Ligand binder design. Structure first.
Ligand SMILES: N[C@@H](CCCC[NH3+])C(=O)O
Ligand SMILES: N[C@@H](CCCC[NH3+])C(=O)O
Ligand SMILES: N[C@@H](CCCC[NH3+])C(=O)O
Ligand SMILES: [Mn+2]
Ligand SMILES: [Mn+2]
Ligand SMILES: [Mn+2]
Ligand SMILES: [Mn+2]
Ligand SMILES: [Mn+2]
Ligand SMILES: [Mn+2]
Lengths: 313, 313, 313
């Protein structure tokens, strides 16, 4: 469809820095050209400038709360802009803490959006349940309204307003969920398909239930937050928190091909691609190649082929 | 069943030459002995002699049309021979352009045959829609009757007669289909199961629908044209046009085990094995080992075991 | 649940020796600590002392019958002990010949047990049908009552009493079954899901049918004999008899997560882990890492997460 690309070179949501290079390598792989090579009206809003916030001491256990809170605030406004421009926002990260601004900004122009979260983790720890202190593992806790009250006033997020309900989101691919996170999942009744459910039903039924769950009552704009560590590390090794037994390349593409076909995709996140973590230059291209493949699927690239409304014979 | 092996060391359907070695390595892996190690009456018709055709300038964009047209013509007669001998023709390639002669020759003794095409591609470009000019990506266009009129008189194929309908064939494993090819697929209503449908239904349902589709109305001889690049390159890397996200080793064997059980297998093609393309000697044996495994399945080798009609206790 | 760990450093059921190290590396990977890190009351009964039996000439074709028969006899008593202690026996092997003592000892305190055998092989050759002579490929033949009469008096097993029926066991993952073994399977009507049935139905339906088959008539204690070569060698390479096209890591965990949820697991076997066979130190840790993962699943570790009966918010 009509795309609005925005680069988000941010890494302060976690320890390993090379993730802020994601935009660079994803663009070098020729993402723009590839998109344009389709029914895509592409406008790159460039890379957001994430100014240094030198004085950002931990809030209790939470690290770099201000630079994170700031990076998400800046992105929220940018996403809202591209949406007001009638364009599908494509945010290239950058660590997953940015989802806070991406989804918030999306919910401003489209408060009825539905979220599909592909990840190996649920990223729903609260500033109080997290043990690591890394904000790229808490983005979800800031957006849920039902958790409005368990989120302390962390410096940098006083602009945040929970914008989604526990039932407006579906997780797919989970395989490393903390105890407090699992508790929250069962308590708020969050719909999820861990790797156990994917193995059980098959990726087809999984998506069928997902789209039906989020679009059942009525059609709403869709937001896909794709963490690359959601796929098995044999496909996307250059990422910070890899977990074996992930979604295959095929399941990765099947999810996006299906979402694309809904025609309701309005927001997309490609997160956690960290080139510095590749053990070899091949693991690096293998990660970026895969991250690009999943992106092109979101916008039309089908494995059975594509063709223009013309007579080829 | 009763087999008729024929070697087809041909490569002129494409650029990379080492594919004409397929017969050699497939036999060195001990294919004959393996087959004989079963309920197989094996007769090797040797390797066809593909005489040099030095004067073979391109026909427009089409490369080596005469040597290709000749190689397929020679094979067609050989396959017809082994079939008239009441034997399941097993053609070891060689690039996929040979399918033209294999299927044509098969259709002479068994004009009612049904075709199952396992490949990452549809190989249905016409001399006019192809952009590469490589004939191993156009074999299908010469055999379909509905395309009788969109195929120009290319030097070397005036012996060709479309022998199959758009509904006598089922593709399985597609993941890199050109635009003109996709157009033809939807226009002639060709039945196909790209990697998207395999992921959706599961390999079991896929085959179930395939066999039911081709054998529904009535039982007919079956022709299986297996391109090794149909399977994921992690299993068959030594091939010319590999595409990630392919059929697994297991799905590869499940397809053949199922076809075998139909008891209607009459023609088999093992194509695109190119040893020169192996990055290591292991990728080479890994490709040939896999190509052999799929062949033995076609003739009885079952993963649950096999035993002779005797009392082992 | 409440566990009773027993080390079984035995290798005389086959040729390659490094398998008797299994207990050592599985414990070094910190298995005990991991188990304890759950709702597990763990008591390690140490490693059984498998005294040397220098004079153990082959019985016809059968190798090391006395040391094998002795090792299984010793284990049977140890398993019976831990069971009488109201604990789920967790036997770390060691080659698969030990299953004879593990299952026998289990059947003493729980004669109504049901067996689930995950392996690439059926290990049901008789001292008379085996061609290799290796007892780790015959454990099943000594336990079936219906085969009481086809088992010659092999030195070291006069203590053995067939303790299970042909219908009290279900095989999962088969892909290399001898002819005599296949004959026995079809003759005694043994329920099995080779890799062909897993591909067909999907791992979910497979387990569903398995648990329903063994628990259909009524709930009974379950014995899971897990051979690591059951999983594809890309996950567990450090094992003696690897076969490509195995169960994935995911299917490996799905099987155990499901069994765990039955709540009827009473006996568990982790066999064939041979560190000496790793081609690299990574294949070694990759094998042991995987062998540990499947073990923790058996006792509660779920991929969707876990949490204590408390309020995390
Ligand atoms: N759930 C863990 C890991 C998060 C990884 C995010 N990329 C945490 O809260 O730190
Ligand atoms: N479809 C492409 C690739 C074909 C590859 C065949 N092995 C073409 O027409 O050239
Ligand atoms: N079935 C073969 C192989 C067994 C492998 C056991 N780990 C035999 O009887 O020797
Ligand atoms: Mn993650
Ligand atoms: Mn994430
Ligand atoms: Mn192909
Ligand atoms: Mn082909
Ligand atoms: Mn085995
Ligand atoms: Mn075994």
């Amino acid at each position: 469809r009509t795309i609005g690309i925005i680069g988000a070179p941010f890494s302060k949501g976690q320890p390993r820095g090379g993730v802020e290079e994601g935009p660079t390598v994803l663009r070098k792989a020729g993402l723009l050209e590839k998109l344009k090579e389709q029914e895509c009206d592409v406008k790159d809003y460039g890379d957001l400038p994430f100014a240094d916030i030198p004085n950002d001491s931990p809030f209790q256990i939470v690290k770099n709360p201000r630079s994170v809170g700031k990076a998400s605030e800046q992105l929220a406004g940018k996403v809202a802009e591209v949406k007001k421009n009638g364009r599908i926002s494509l945010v290239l990260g950058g660590d997953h803490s940015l989802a806070i601004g991406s989804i918030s900004g999306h919910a401003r122009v489209h408060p009825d959006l539905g979220v599909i979260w592909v990840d190996a983790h649920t990223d729903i720890n609260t500033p109080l349940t997290t043990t690591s202190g890394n904000l790229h593992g808490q983005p979800v806790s800031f957006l849920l309204k039902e958790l409005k009250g368990k989120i302390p006033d962390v410096p940098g997020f006083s602009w945040v307003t929970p914008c989604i309900s526990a039932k407006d989101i579906v997780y797919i691919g989970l395989r490393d969920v903390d105890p407090g996170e699992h508790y929250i999942l069962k308590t708020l009744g969050i719909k999820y398909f861990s790797m156990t459910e994917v193995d059980r039903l098959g990726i087809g039924k999984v998506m069928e239930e997902t789209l039906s769950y989020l679009l059942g009552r009525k059609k709403r704009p869709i937001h896909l937050s794709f963490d690359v560590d959601g796929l098995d590390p044999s496909f996307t090794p250059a990422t910070g928190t890899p977990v074996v037994g992930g979604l295959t390349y095929r399941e990765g593409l099947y999810i996006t091909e299906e979402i694309y076909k809904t025609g309701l995709l309005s927001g997309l996140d490609i997160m956690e691609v960290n080139p510095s973590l590749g053990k070899t230059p091949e693991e690096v291209t293998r990660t970026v190649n895969t991250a690009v493949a999943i992106t092109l699927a979101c916008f039309g690239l089908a494995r059975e082929g594509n063709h223009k409304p013309i007579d080829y014979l």
